[PDB]
């Protein structure tokens, strides 16, 4: 977890919307089983894509204001932002290989 940015409702614009480069945002909660299943895969991706992608997390129990703005309905949900806008989304758990394919489809 050392390479994952900790987001809050108030820091979202500064950290995500004005980010340089692609940022992957994980919407999670402690009670969410599938969310905890993909946590290690996000750490692997953070290492593997270091320098090309920033990974971040937003706990929806602690920051309830952001999810509703993006129409999130379930967790985990992954949002891929580029240039201040959502470029792609993925709802539900997935394997490392599926995540890599999803990223590669959007990073160029
Ligand atoms: Cu770490």
In CATH, which superfamily holds the domain spanning 1-108? Answer: Glutaredoxin (3.40.30.10)
Distance CA 20, CA 17 (A): 9
CA-CA distances (angstroms) from residue 11 to 19, 42, 65, 79, 104? 11, 21, 12, 16, 27
Please confirm, yes or no, whether 35 is among the known catalytic residues: yes
Give residue 80 CA to ligand 1 midpoint distance, Å. 20
Distance 54 CA to ligand 1 centre (A): 13
Q: How was this structure determined?
A: X-ray
Which residues are within 8 A (CB) of 83 and not within 5 positions of it... i.e. 6 or more apart? none
Helical spans, DSSP H, in 1-108: 12, 33-48, 66-69, 96-107
CA distance 48 to 8: 25
Structure tokens at 29: 């909660």
Catalytic residue, from 23, 35, 56, 99: name it: 35
Ligand 1 center–CA 71 separation, angstroms: 29
CB 80 within 8 A of CB 86: yes
21 CA to centre of ligand 1 in angstroms: 20
């Amino acid at each position: 977890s050392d390479k994952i940015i900790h987001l809050t409702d108030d820091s979202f614009d500064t950290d995500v919307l004005k980010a340089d480069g692609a940022i992957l945002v994980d919407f999670w909660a402690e009670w969410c089983g599938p969310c905890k299943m993909i946590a290690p895969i996000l750490d692997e991706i953070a290492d593997e894509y270091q320098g090309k992608l920033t990974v971040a997390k937003l706990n929806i129990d602690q920051n309830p204001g952001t999810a509703p703005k993006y129409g999130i309905r379930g967790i985990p949900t992954l949002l891929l932002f580029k240039n201040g806008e959502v470029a792609a989304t993925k709802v539900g758990a997935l394997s490392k290989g599926q995540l890599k394919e999803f990223l590669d489809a959007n990073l160029a």
